Amino acid sequence: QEWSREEEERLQAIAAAHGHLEWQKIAEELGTSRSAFQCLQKFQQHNKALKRKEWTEEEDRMLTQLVQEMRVGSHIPYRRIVYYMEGRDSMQLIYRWT
DNA sequence: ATATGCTTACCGTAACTTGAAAGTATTTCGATTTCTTGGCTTTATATATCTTGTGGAAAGGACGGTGCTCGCTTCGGC
């Protein structure tokens, strides 16, 4: 069975109280009868730390270097930017050249 | 001399969009299975008759260390 949007709060609370070291004990103390890998995916999907914030200037240098080094025609491989630049997903990163 | 007036660069998530990797049903090629006939094995006295294959004969060609001292021959003597 899927979640009911009521266990992620206690999950992140226990993860912050323990230090995000061992997710197995966290899942066992949470009492969901599910594997740690099955709940960690939804935890990271509901987490906000995976995203980014207002754009700086020093990262523009790296983006321009990566473009001038591995861009082809009118297509830009933003997946390479996701691989190199941490924090940027594939959805909202394309705006960096839109 | 400055705040709200409207105007627009842009960093908040979202879905219907183009096409390559990955799971799914389907008929076709080929390999497998199952039928068919028919001889294998016993017997029966019959017995035909003509050839086959043999066999003990005839008869052949085929290959089956070192003195040591009698005596044998050949010249060879005067």
- Spatial separation of the C-alpha atoms in residues A9 and A80, rounded to whole Å: 33
Alpha helix (H) residue ranges in A2-77: 8-18, 23-30, 36-46, 58-70
Shortest CA–C1' contact from A96: which nucleotide? B11
Q: State which nucleotides on strand B lie below 7 Å from a protein beta carbon.
A: 10-15
Q: Minimal CA–CA distance to A51: which of A12, A16, A86?
A: A86
Identify the H or E element spanning A79: helix A78-84
* Residue A59 CA to its chain's centroid (Å): 18
The gap between the terminal CA atoms of chain A, to the nearest Å, is: 41
Kindly determine whether the C-beta of residue A6 is less than 7 Å away from any atom of nucleic acid strand B.
no
- Spatial separation of the C-alpha atoms in residues A56 and A21, rounded to whole Å: 31
Q: DSSP 3-state assignment of A72? A: strand
Kindly determine whether the C-beta of residue A64 is less than 7 Å away from any atom of nucleic acid strand B.
no
- Spatial separation of the C-alpha atoms in residues A51 and A54, rounded to whole Å: 11
A19 φ/ψ sector (left φ>0, alpha ψ -120 to 50, else beta): left
Q: Are A62 and A84 in contact (CB under 8 A)?
A: yes
Kindly determine whether the C-beta of residue A34 is less than 7 Å away from any atom of nucleic acid strand B.
no
| Method used to solve the structure | cryo-EM
Kindly determine whether the C-beta of residue A83 is less than 7 Å away from any atom of nucleic acid strand B.
no
